[PDB]
Structure formats: structure tokens, C-alpha cells
């Protein structure tokens, strides 16, 4: 049995009654200027009309195709410092016993990276697959890359994460990665990935890459125009 001395003291939160309870006021928080600036920058890029060469970067690989591309490319990460030190020790041993370094070292296969290097490979038509980060700032560094790849007939895809590409190439960020050639046991996987990129990314973005982006209205303005159109239709 409950104690008879326990009492309920409900509070009325109407106007002029008891003090208002502490609510979530995060929508009305006075933010620091850097937070307010980055949010407003994103909003302004949504509100203005975006030319197609920039707006094409909103169309990226889906989760499955990005995971398959990373599954292939994670077998071709560049040499670490320890691995290079061990290789150089073995080559120094071969030179000491009077052998060429190519006798103890095989031809490497790596993911190609560095923007100038990859642009050179595309222009020489050596790249077989090009992956471009969607968030390179300044955007001008990669804004010509889909046009260049289309002119050279190279399969490309826009993928989310310069940091994600940096994890491939042992860096913090990477603007672009390319595959030129792989090993014989992964040639079939690369060809299947290239066909998947062509049929599931490039054909699907063939029309949407030519459109203008942005021009989205804010919430209150959208509701205002909906109410205005409803009133015009009613009257």
C-alpha cells in the first residue's frame, strides 16, 4: 500500500501560471560564428542554382558498388615504410652478392594516386578506372576530371570520401585514385568492377549530370508558396 502522506502537485504551464519547464531549445541556440558559417554555407549552396559541372558531384556510387570497389582496391595499397625498408635491405643484399635488384624484386602493382600523376595517366590513356572524391575543396582541382575521362574513354566514378581514398593510399586525404593494371588473379575482378561501374553508375547519371543543381527552397518559403497556390486554386 502506498503512503497516504504522498501527494501529487501538478504544474500548469499555461500563460501566467507556473514557471515554464526546461525544454530543448537547440533550434534557437546562439551558435558560434564558425558553426553558423558552415551551416549557412551549406544552405546557400542549396538555395542558389548550381551549374552542372559542379552539380554532377552530388551523384555518387551507392553503398554496394563502393564496397566492391574498395574490396578490389584494398588489395593494391602502396608500400608501407617498413615494407620498403625490408625490400631495400633485400636489394642491398643482392647488390652485395653481385645481383641486380630486379632479381630479388618483382614488378609492383599499386593503386595510383596524386592528382597530377593521375591526370597524366588519364591523358596517356593508361588508367583503367578512375575514382574521384566528391568533396574536394577547391572544387576546380577535379571539376574537369569527368570531362577529361569522357574524352579519353576512361571509366570513372565519383565516390564519397577523400578521407576514404586516403585510407587506400596511406594518407589523410586523396582527391583521386586510379587503377592502371592489376595482377592476373584480380584481372577478372577488375573487369567485372569496370562493367559494373559503366552499367550502374555512368548510364544512370548520363542524363542527370547535365542538369542544374540547387534551387531548393527553404521550409517556411515552401509552406508559404503551398499556401499561396492553395488560396489561388480555391479563389
Amino acid at each position: 500500500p502506498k503512503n497516504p502522506l504522498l501527494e501529487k502537485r501538478p504544474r500548469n504551464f499555461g500563460i501566467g501560471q507556473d514557471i515554464q519547464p526546461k525544454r530543448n531549445l537547440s533550434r534557437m541556440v546562439k551558435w558560434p560564428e564558425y558553426i553558423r558559417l558552415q551551416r549557412q554555407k551549406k544552405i546557400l549552396r542549396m538555395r542558389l542554382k548550381v551549374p552542372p559541372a559542379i552539380a554532377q558531384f552530388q551523384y555518387t556510387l551507392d553503398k554496394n558498388l563502393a564496397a566492391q570497389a574498395f574490396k578490389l582496391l584494398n588489395k593494391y595499397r602502396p608500400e608501407t615504410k617498413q615494407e620498403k625498408k625490408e625490400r631495400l635491405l633485400r636489394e642491398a643484399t643482392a647488390i652485395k652478392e653481385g645481383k641486380k635488384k630486379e632479381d630479388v624484386s618483382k614488378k609492383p602493382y599499386t593503386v595510383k594516386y596524386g592528382l597530377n600523376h593521375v591526370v597524366g595517366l588519364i591523358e596517356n590513356k593508361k588508367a583503367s578506372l578512375v575514382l574521384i572524391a566528391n568533396d574536394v575543396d577547391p572544387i576546380e582541382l577535379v571539376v574537369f576530371l569527368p570531362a577529361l575521362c569522357r574524352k579519353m574513354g576512361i571509366p570513372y566514378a565519383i565516390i564519397k570520401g577523400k578521407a576514404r581514398l586516403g585510407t587506400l593510399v596511406h594518407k589523410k586525404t586523396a582527391a583521386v585514385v586510379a587503377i592502371t593494371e592489376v595482377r592476373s588473379e584480380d584481372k577478372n575482378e577488375l573487369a567485372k568492377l569496370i562493367s559494373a561501374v559503366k552499367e550502374g553508375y555512368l548510364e544512370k547519371v548520363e542524363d542527370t549530370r547535365k542538369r542544374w543543381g540547387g534551387g531548393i527552397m527553404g521550409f517556411k518559403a515552401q509552406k508559404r508558396e503551398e499556401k499561396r497556390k492553395k488560396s489561388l486554386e480555391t479563389a
Binding site: 568492377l193 552499367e199 550502374g200
Partner: protein, 93 residues
């Protein structure tokens, strides 16, 4: 209202009746389903027909799953029109 029929091909080995029913029931409930199979062996011919109860549910599933890279196969997911749905397509489903 009207059912929707999806043709799915490039099926990897293992994407069979129970797997297809369970996977596409996430999109919407399935009226009928048949994997095309060889009578001499029982082996799959890497294609199947799924009749969803609802048409744009079938359309959403097909546009989602078309060109999906699954175990080395780029799937073929298409909506077949009701005019070319065969009357005996789901015999044995």
C-alpha cells in the same frame, strides 16, 4: 490492385527461392515466385520471375536492384509488362 511481375536474371548460385522470397518480401509481399530450373538436373538457370502483389512496389524493387553487383554477377532486374506476362508463367510456382 494489379500485380507486378519482375524478371530477374544473372542470379548467383545461392540466390534461390527462399533467398529471393525473403529478400524481396522486405520491399513488399510476394504473390508468386518461380526460379527457372532444368528438369534433368534440378539446377537453376540463373533466372526467376517474381509476381508482387502491388505494381509500383515491384517497380521500386526492380529499379533498386537492377545492375546490382552480387557475388560477381551484375543482376538484371526488369519489370515485364502485363501484356507480355505469359498466362502460364507461374505454373509450378
Amino acid at each position: 490492385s494489379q500485380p507486378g511481375v519482375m524478371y530477374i536474371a544473372r542470379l548467383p548460385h545461392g540466390f534461390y527461392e527462399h533467398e529471393l522470397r525473403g529478400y524481396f518480401s522486405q520491399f513488399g509481399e510476394i504473390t508468386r515466385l518461380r526460379v527457372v530450373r532444368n528438369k534433368k538436373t534440378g539446377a537453376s538457370r540463373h533466372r526467376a520471375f517474381i509476381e508482387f502483389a502491388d505494381a509500383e512496389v515491384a517497380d521500386i524493387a526492380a529499379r533498386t536492384m537492377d545492375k546490382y553487383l552480387l557475388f560477381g554477377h551484375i543482376l538484371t532486374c526488369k519489370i515485364v509488362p502485363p501484356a507480355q506476362v505469359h498466362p502460364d508463367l507461374f505454373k509450378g510456382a
